[model samples]
Target chain A: GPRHLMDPHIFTSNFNNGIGRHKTYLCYEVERLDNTSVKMDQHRGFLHNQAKNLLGFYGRHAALRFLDLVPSLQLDPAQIYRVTWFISWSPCFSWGCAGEVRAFLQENTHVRLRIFAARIYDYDPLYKEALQMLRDAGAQVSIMTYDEFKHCWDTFVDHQGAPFQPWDGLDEHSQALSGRLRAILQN
Target chain B: GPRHLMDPHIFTSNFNNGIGRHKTYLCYEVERLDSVKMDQHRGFLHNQAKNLLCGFYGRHAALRFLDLVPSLQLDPAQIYRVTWFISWSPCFSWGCAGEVRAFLQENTHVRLRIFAARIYDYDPLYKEALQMLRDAGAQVSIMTYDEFKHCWDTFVDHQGAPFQPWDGLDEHSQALSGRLRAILQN
Candidate 1:
C-alpha cells in the first residue's frame, strides 16, 4: 500500500518544471450513453465501415492521413463523443487549438473535460491566458504524476519495447508546472 | 427617408454562400435591473470593466469573465449581452460567434461584451427576419462609432481597416437592433 506518489528524485534536481518532451500526443476517451446495435454484452465502441469506409467515426477526417476508426455508433447526442483529454502538453496556442477547444467545450453541456497533462508548454505565448480561460469555462486541468504515467504505459502503450524510464525533465517539470497552474486557478 | 436600407455593394459582391468574414465582433449592451449604487445609471457595458480588461469574453471565457465584473444587475432567467453583429458568414461551423452566443445557457456568468456593428441587410435577412433570429437566444443592440471601434479593436482578426462609418451603418444598426429587442423588451 502506498502512502505517497512519485519517486524521491521527483523532489530532487533531475525533474524540471513538471513536464513533456518536444513531441505532443493527446489521448482522449469519451463517455456516451450507449446507443449502438452491438447489444448490451459487446463493449466495442464501433464495428462497421472498416475498409476505408467503415463508418466507425473515422478521424483526421474522411480524406488522407487516416488516423482512427472509431466504433459504429448512432448519430445521436446520447451516443455523441463526450470527451476528456490526457496529453503531453496543454492544448496549444500555436495551432489556436486552445481557443477552438474552449469554444467546443462551451457548445455542448452534455460533454465535460478532465484534462491531465504531463507539463505546460511555457513557450506558448498565449498558454497562460488560454489555460486559465479553459478552467473558467468549466474544463478541469491537472498535471500527471509518475504512477499515472506508468499506468498509461502499461495499459495503452503495448510497452515491452522498454520499461517505463522517466524522462530527463519529467518530475521537476511536472511539479513546478503543477504549482504554477495551481496559482493560475487560485487567483 | 432612407431609400434602400443597406449598400448596393453589399448585395452586389459582399456575400458568399450567405455571410461572415470568419470574424466575430460582439457588441453587447447590457441593461441590468438597475439595482447597484455606483452604477444605477451605468449605461455602457464597458464601464463595469476595471480597465482594458473589458473585452475578450468570447466563448472561451465569457461565462467566468462575467462572474467577476463588479456589480451587475443580474436576472437568473434573463440574459443580456444584448447583441447584434455583421458576422460576414452564415451559421455554418462551430467557429461563428453567433453559434457560440446561441449556445450559452443562462447560468453561465461571464458578462459577455456586445459589439453591435451595422445591421447587415442582404435586404432579405431584413428587419423582422433578424428579430426572429433572437428566438434562438440573446438580444441584439446597436454599435456606435465609439463602441464600434471598441468591438473591432477587441475581436477583429488582425486589425484590418478602421471601421468606416457608412451612411446607413448606424441607422440600419438601430433599425434592426431595435426591432430585434422589441420582441423581448418586456
Candidate 2:
C-alpha cells in the first residue's frame, strides 16, 4: 500500500537533444515476502511517476551502461533515488551497481544521491566496496536487513510513521545494529 | 593505445530509497588475438556498439552513435577486427532470440565472440540465440558462472590489462584495416 518508502521524486534533465525541460521519475521496486518465500515475481512497482527503477532480474542490470550514455544525452542527475537488494553477493551485480555509481559520482559533483539497500545480511567485500564507493561518491546510504525492511513496510502500511529510519553513512550500519539490538533487549 | 574499445562506460541508478550516489565495478574476461586473428576482436566491438545503441536509443540514434566513435570513423566495409565484447541482453526471455539472430545474419561480415555461462540456461531463448550466432559465424565460448565471476575479478585485478590493444597487431595494420574477407567474398 504505502508505495515508496520515502520521497521518490528524483529528476534528470531531458534528453530530447535540448528540446525539453528537466524530467523527473519516481523510482523504486517492492518485494513482498510470501510465507518465507519470495517469488521471482515478488518484485513489483508500488508507486511510480516518470521515474525509473533498477529492480528485478534486469534491475541493476546494465545500469552503468545507462548512466554512461546519460552525459552524452545532456541529462543531469539532480535528484535520483537508487535502491537495491543484496540477497547475496554477486560480482556482476555488485560490480555493476558499484562501478556505475562510482563513475556517476566522479562526473556529477554537488549532486546528492539517496541510496537504500534491502536484504543486506552480513558485511562482505562486495558490500564493503559498495559502501565505500557510495561514501566516496557522497551518497546518503540507507541499509536494512530483511526484518528491518519488513518492519518498515508494515509500519508504512499501518501509517504508523516513516517507513524506515535511514542510516546516514558508512557508520550507519553499525549504528543501526546497536539500536536494533538494544530494541530487541528492551522488548 | 586503444583502450576501452571493448568495455564501454555505462551507468544506471537504483530504485530503492534516499537519493544516493554510488559507482560499481564489474570485470569480464576476453581473449587476445594475434596479428593474424585481430579481425575477430575488431569486428566484435564494432558490431556490439551498434547493437547496444540500437537496443537502447533506437535505430537512428544507434546509427548516429556508431558514427561518433573515433575508431569507427572508417566505413563499415573498411574495418575488420573482431574483438570480444560481452553484454547482458534484456531480450533473452522476451522471445527476441530470432531478432538478435536476424541482426547477426544480416551482418555476418562482423564476427562476434560470444561468451556464455550457466546462468544463460535460465533463459528459454538463450540456446536458440547461441545457435543462431554460431550458425551466423560468431565464435561461442561457454564457461561456468564461477569462471565468469573470476574473469571480472582478474580483469579488474590486472588494472584492465586484458583490454589494452595488442601491439602485435600493429605489424598487421594493413590486415586489420582491410575489409572483412568473408563479407568481401559474399
Candidate 3:
C-alpha cells in the first residue's frame, strides 16, 4: 500500500518575489543519520573542463562554477549524525530559451526537487510571501556571493559545530565532479 | 479502497549555485487523474497561489500567469500534466538579508503562471541531490517542458480543450467551474 500527498493547497495572491537574483526553488530536505560507524563519501571532485564540456548551455555551468567549494585534499563527512541536501533548479527567463527546455533539463537531472528563487531589480513587493513560502515549505534558504564562500561554508559546512573540519584546498575541478555525481543519481 | 503514493522518491541537488537566488531549483513533475480532480476545490486557492508565486520567483509569472487561460483550459489527453508543485532550498539559506530579498519584492503584484507555459532550466553538470533519506528513498527523473505542461493541463483543466460546450465567452468561467466541481464530487 502506498500513501499519496494530495496536491498541496497553494494560495496564489499571498506571494512575494524573492529579493535580489532570488527565484523560487523546490527540493527535499533529506535528513540522513549515519547510524553505522562508517563515514559516508561526501567528498566531490570535478574535471578541469567539466564546466565547458559537460554543460551545453554555457551560462548555467559558468554560474555554478562560482558557488563551487573545492573539497580539501581529502575531506569527507565523519559520522554525519544528520545530513541535509537540497536539490533544486534555476528558473529564470535569461540565458535559457524556454520553459520546456528548462523543464526537460530538470526532469532528467539527477535531482528532482525543482525549487525556484528570483532576484528583484533594486526592490519589489511580495517579498514577505517569499519568506513565508520557504518557511511553510520548510526550506533552508540562503543568499551570498561566491567570493564570500566563507559565509556559505560556515552555514552548510561548519554550522553543525561537529568534529568535521572545513576543507579549503581543492579547486573548481572537484565542484564539477561532484555535480556530475549528483546528475547521475537523478537519471 | 484508497490508493496511495507514499514513497515519493524525493530528490534535490545543489550546483555552483543552489535553488534559491543561487543557481538551483526543485524538481516538481507528477500527474494523476484522481489526484487532480479529487483535490481541486480544497486546494484551488492554494494551487493557484503556488503556480503564481513559483512563476513569480521563476520570473515567468507575468508571461505565464494561470488565470489568463479560459477556465478548465488544460487538455486532458496531453499525456503530461501539472499534478503538483514543489519548491526547494539548496543549503541552509533563507531570505531576509541578501540580494535575493530585494528580488522577492519586485514581482509581488505581478501576475504569475497566467500563460500556463511550462518553464524549467536544465543543466547536466550543475546538480545537488539530497533526498528524504528515509525508508522511502527519493529517485529523480527528467521530462520535456512540453511533456510536463501537457500532463499538467490535461490533468488539471481536462486537457487544454474543455467540454464547456458553448463557445460564448461569458459562460466559460461558470460553466467550467460547475463541471470541475462535479468532477471533484465524483
In order, the first chain's TM-score in every candidate is: 0.61, 0.36, 0.23
Badly placed stretches (over 4 Å) of model 3 are A1-90, A97-101, A104-106, A114-187, B1-186
Candidate 2, B125: how far from true, in Å?
A: 3.3
Best by DockQ: 3
> lDDT per residue, candidate 3, B1-186, as tens digits?
111111111111211112222232222232334334323211111111234555633222211213222232444443223322222211112221122222224423211111111112232211221111011122222222342333334322221243232133233334433433343243
Better of 1 and 3 by DockQ: 3
Taking the tens digit of each residue's C-alpha lDDT, what string does model 3 give over A125-149? 3333333333333333332123223
Model 3 Cα shift for residue A14 (angstroms): 28
Native interface contacts retained, candidate 1: 0.00
Tens digit of lDDT per residue, candidate 2, span A98-138? 67767776776633455443323233345545555656667
Model 2 chain A, poorest ten-residue lDDT window?
A8-17
What's the residue-level lDDT of B22 in candidate 2?
29
The lDDT per prediction is 0.42, 0.34, 0.25
Tens-digit lDDT string for candidate 1 (A1-187) = 0001112222121222343344454444455544542222111111111122253542221111101222222324554444444565666555455666666567755556677776677778877886887787688888877766765554334233456767676677668778988986686
Output the better candidate (1/2) by DockQ: 2
- Is model 2 an incorrect, acceptable, medium or high docking prediction? incorrect
Which candidate achieves the best TM-score against the true structure? 1
Worst 10 residues of 3 chain A by lDDT: A10-19
Residue A67, model 2, lDDT: 47
